Amino acid sequence: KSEIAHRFNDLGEKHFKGLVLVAFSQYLQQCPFEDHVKLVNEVTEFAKKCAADESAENCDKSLHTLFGDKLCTVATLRATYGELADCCEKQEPERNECFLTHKDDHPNLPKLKPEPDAQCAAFQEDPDKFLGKYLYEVARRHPYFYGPELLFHAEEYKADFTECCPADDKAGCLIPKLDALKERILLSSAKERLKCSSFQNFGERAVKAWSVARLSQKFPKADFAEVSKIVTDLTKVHKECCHGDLLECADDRADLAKYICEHQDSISGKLKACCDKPLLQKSHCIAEVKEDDLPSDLPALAADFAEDKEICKHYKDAKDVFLGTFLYEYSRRHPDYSVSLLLRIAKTYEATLEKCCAEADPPACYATVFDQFTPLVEEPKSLVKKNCDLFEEVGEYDFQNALIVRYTKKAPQVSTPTLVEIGRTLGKVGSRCCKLPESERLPCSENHLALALNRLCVLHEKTPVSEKITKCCTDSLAERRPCFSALELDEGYVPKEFKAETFTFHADICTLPEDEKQIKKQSALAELVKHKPKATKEQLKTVLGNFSAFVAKCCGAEDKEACFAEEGPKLVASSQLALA
Numbered sequence: 001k002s003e004i005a006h007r008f009n010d011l012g013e014k015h016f017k018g019l020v021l022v023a024f025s026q027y028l029q030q031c032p033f034e035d036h037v038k039l040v041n042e043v044t045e046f047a048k049k050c051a052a053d054e055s056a057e058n059c060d061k062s063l064h065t066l067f068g069d070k071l072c073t074v075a076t077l078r079a080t081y082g083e084l085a086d087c088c089e090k091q092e093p094e095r096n097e098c099f100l101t102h103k104d105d106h107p108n109l110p111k112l113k114p115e116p117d118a119q120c121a122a123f124q125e126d127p128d129k130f131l132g133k134y135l136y137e138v139a140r141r142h143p144y145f146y147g148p149e150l151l152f153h154a155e156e157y158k159a160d161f162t163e164c165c166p167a168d169d170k171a172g173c174l175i176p177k178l179d180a181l182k183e184r185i186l187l188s189s190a191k192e193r194l195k196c197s198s199f200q201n202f203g204e205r206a207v208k209a210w211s212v213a214r215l216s217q218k219f220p221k222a223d224f225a226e227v228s229k230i231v232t233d234l235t236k237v238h239k240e241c242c243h244g245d246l247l248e249c250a251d252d253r254a255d256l257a258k259y260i261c262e263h264q265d266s267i268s269g270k271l272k273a274c275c276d277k278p279l280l281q282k283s284h285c286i287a288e289v290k291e292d293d294l295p296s297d298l299p300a301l302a303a304d305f306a307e308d309k310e311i312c313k314h315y316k317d318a319k320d321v322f323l324g325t326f327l328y329e330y331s332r333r334h335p336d337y338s339v340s341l342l343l344r345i346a347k348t349y350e351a352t353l354e355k356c357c358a359e360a361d362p363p364a365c366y367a368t369v370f371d372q373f374t375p376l377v378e379e380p381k382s383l384v385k386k387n388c389d390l391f392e393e394v395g396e397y398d399f400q401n402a403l404i405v406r407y408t409k410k411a412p413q414v415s416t417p418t419l420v421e422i423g424r425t426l427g428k429v430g431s432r433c434c435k436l437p438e439s440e441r442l443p444c445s446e447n448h449l450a451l452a453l454n455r456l457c458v459l460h461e462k463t464p465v466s467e468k469i470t471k472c473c474t475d476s477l478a479e480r481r482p483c484f485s486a487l488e489l490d491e492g493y494v495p496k497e498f499k500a501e502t503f504t505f506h507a508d509i510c511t512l513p514e515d516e517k518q519i520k521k522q523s524a525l526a527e528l529v530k531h532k533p534k535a536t537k538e539q540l541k542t543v544l545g546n547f548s549a550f551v552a553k554c555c556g557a558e559d560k561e562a563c564f565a566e567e568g569p570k571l572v573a574s575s576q577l578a579l580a
């Protein structure tokens with residue numbers, strides 16, 4: 001009857017306001033903060049009004065109608081948001097869909113540097129404004145961030161400024177925390193963007209399948225029934241959030257978290273610490289909970305899925321339940337597999353039964369079906385061992401460079417910053433995963449990879465440069481990682497013409513902190529590969545190392561610029577002979 005009243009009542013004012021700010025910040029990334037505060041308070045006041053009389057004029061309008069009307073009042077409409085002023089001409093649900101379509105994955109706003117004195121001051125002087133501003137900035141930059149979860153991260157950014165601001169050295173307490181949080185923010189944005197990307201490109205079925213797999217791994221004690229129910233609910237939550245209905249999403253998420261904690265005895269024995277928490281902390285804990293111990297009573301799958309004579313019938317009767325079942329069972333006995341691998345396996349099963357069940361004698365045909373799985377498992381296992389050996393041996397930086405090269409050879413049309421960012425992200429998978437026990441590295445690796453390759457793909461949607469990437473991004477959610485692995489030097493490349501200034505470093509680099517130095521040299525590394533695509537990886541390691549030494553020494557010098565000026569051109573000219 002009054003959606004706005006109903007969400008204001010279930011969520012409470014704090015989480016209601018927060019979520020409406022987040023939603024606004026994502027729909028209008030370019031709109032200044034103060035403009036959004038007033039719109040939030042404005043809509044929020046209306047909610048209150050409606051909550052006390054749901055018959056009041058306009059209280060029965062859809063959320064969209066109310067929210068889109070609010071956004072379409074924001075000043076400097078056409079100048080600041082060109083393409084979004086056209087959306088305000090529309091009725092809902094066209095209008096909502098045009099907003100949604102014009103969200104910007106790489107708005108490329110200033111990097112968020114902590115100002116610890118000036119922010120503690122703003123924290124103590126007005127914490128609501130201060131926390132609000134954090135939601136705004138993160139939302140702004142990650143327009144598909146998982147709404148309820150951002151409020152959770154806003155609670156940790158509060159806990160942080162709370163403990164460090166009263167302290168002696170605010171900047172020493174606060175900076176490593178705010179760095180850890182940014183890392184968690186980025187990972188979380190990447191997981192949610194993979195969810196939204198899967199809806200957009202593959203549909204709701206592909207999200208269900210993914211979620212059956214992962215929840216079955218996580219909750220192996222649970223019966224198919226119960227995973228199905230959680231998955232149906234979880235898929236609706238994320239569909240909503242992804243489509244921007246953040247208030248609905250949060251409300252539904254809290255009901256799901258209630259449910260799971262109502263039923264943990266029949267879901268998992270790890271939900272116990274999670275269930276003794278406030279709403280946001282609990283939902284978060286459930287969402288990241290460790291995998292439960294395997295049960296002693298796991299069935300043998302062979303009889304039911306490869307030996308049974310009734311398999312084609314069972315399968316023509318309800319494919320999706322038969323397949324969902326195989327996926328649930330295979331998944332829960334395999335936490336040591338990646339989600340994507342589990343889904344390639346299911347897709348091979350399904351394929352084997354469609355081929356075999358139309359054949360002359362199907363059971364002889366599907367008898368060996370589990371053996372089709374074996375090379376699918378060997379492949380990413382080998383990859384992971386091979387990349388972790390490399391990592392263990394050369395370290396993060398060089399492993400990142402190995403990858404910058406590998407990827408620049410595959411898609412040398414990608415801008416340098418993208419290639420650098422993706423090789424760096426990929427190399428950090430190295431860091432996180434290679435150190436885990438031997439049976440956790442394949443899932444760690446391939447699950448985090450999926451996150452990074454989706455980032456790449458999302459960027460490429462905005463700024464398309466390469467048919468090879470378009471193909472790999474669209475052909476199969478489960479096949480992405482193998483599709484990217486199989487890519488080799490684009491022979492279609494005409495080498496990029498040499499511009500000396502691109503390889504030419506100056507004293508400006510010596511100021512930069514360590515990460516920012518690497519980004520520069522890694523940027524030159526990408527550029528080296530674009531001019532000389534056939535250069536071997538060892539030739540580029542030596543040329544890069546000679547650029548490192550060169551930079552280390554000239555930065556170490558009494559006259560930095562005369563050092564760069566004298567020695568730089570020699571190194572630019574000679575290092576082109578050392579490549580191809």
Ligand SMILES: O=C(O)Cc1ccccc1Nc1c(Cl)cccc1Cl
Binds near residue numbers: 536538544
């Ligand atoms: O690139 C690889 O796959 C591994 C490899 C093997 C031998 C020598 C160098 C590299 N990788 C690599 C590259 Cl391509 C550039 C800079 C530094 C390093 Cl360690």
Ligand SMILES: COc1ccc2cc([C@H](C)C(=O)O)ccc2c1
Binds near residue numbers: 384388427433481485
């Ligand atoms: C364990 O650590 C890694 C890190 C990066 C990787 C990148 C790739 C890409 C997809 C590639 O094209 O080979 C594969 C495996 C990887 C394992």
